[PDB]
Swiss-Prot record:
Consequences of knocking out this gene: Essential; deletion experiments lead to loss of inner membrane protein targeting. Also leads to reduced targeting of lipoproteins Lpp and BRP.
Domain notes: Composed of three domains: the N-terminal N domain, which is responsible for interactions with the ribosome, the central G domain, which binds GTP, and the C-terminal M domain, which binds the RNA and the signal sequence of the RNC.
Domain of life of the source: Bacteria
Subunit architecture: Part of the signal recognition particle protein translocation system, which is composed of SRP and FtsY. SRP is a ribonucleoprotein composed of Ffh and a 4.5S RNA molecule. Metal ions are essential for the formation and stability of the SRP complex. Interacts with the ribosomes, via ribosomal protein L23. Interacts with FtsY.
Protein known as: Signal recognition particle protein
Protein role: Involved in targeting and insertion of nascent membrane proteins into the cytoplasmic membrane. Binds to the hydrophobic signal sequence of the ribosome-nascent chain (RNC) as it emerges from the ribosomes. The SRP-RNC complex is then targeted to the cytoplasmic membrane where it interacts with the SRP receptor FtsY. Interaction with FtsY leads to the transfer of the RNC complex to the Sec translocase for insertion into the membrane, the hydrolysis of GTP by both Ffh and FtsY, and the dissociation of the SRP-FtsY complex into the individual components.
Gene (name only): ffh
Location within or outside the cell: Cytoplasm
Family named by the database record: Belongs to the GTP-binding SRP family. SRP54 subfamily.
Length: 69
RNA sequence: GGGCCUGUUUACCAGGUCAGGUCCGAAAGGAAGCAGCCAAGGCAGGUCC
């Protein structure tokens, strides 16, 4: 399960805008989505970093349920 | 090293185009733009100078 599968799954519109701003590698391994990258992603999808951060936490929450389902 | 070619590589760090999204506007419409791709660069090879 990754930022892609999670993408498979209104405010949802922006759940995209964000992910749509990433790289196949980021989607393939979020555990590297640091500040520099974040900052990029936020402005990428006209969001605030804390928006990205949240979306990271959200998927995080599910990735969890996945790594324990 | 240069030209041409091919393989490969390259998140943002004044290239181009920008799906998605965002911004300003009552509207009409403007603007900045991530990923992609294009291009450019890196690493090699083939080839010609």
């Amino acid at each position: 399960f990754d930022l892609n599968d999670f993408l498979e799954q209104k405010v949802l519109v922006r759940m995209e805008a964000i992910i749509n701003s990433m790289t196949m590698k980021e989607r393939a391994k979020p555990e590297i989505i640091k500040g520099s990258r974040k900052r990029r992603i936020a402005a990428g999808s006209g969001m605030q970093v804390q928006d990205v951060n949240r979306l990271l936490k959200q998927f995080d929450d599910m990735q969890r349920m996945m790594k324990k389902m």
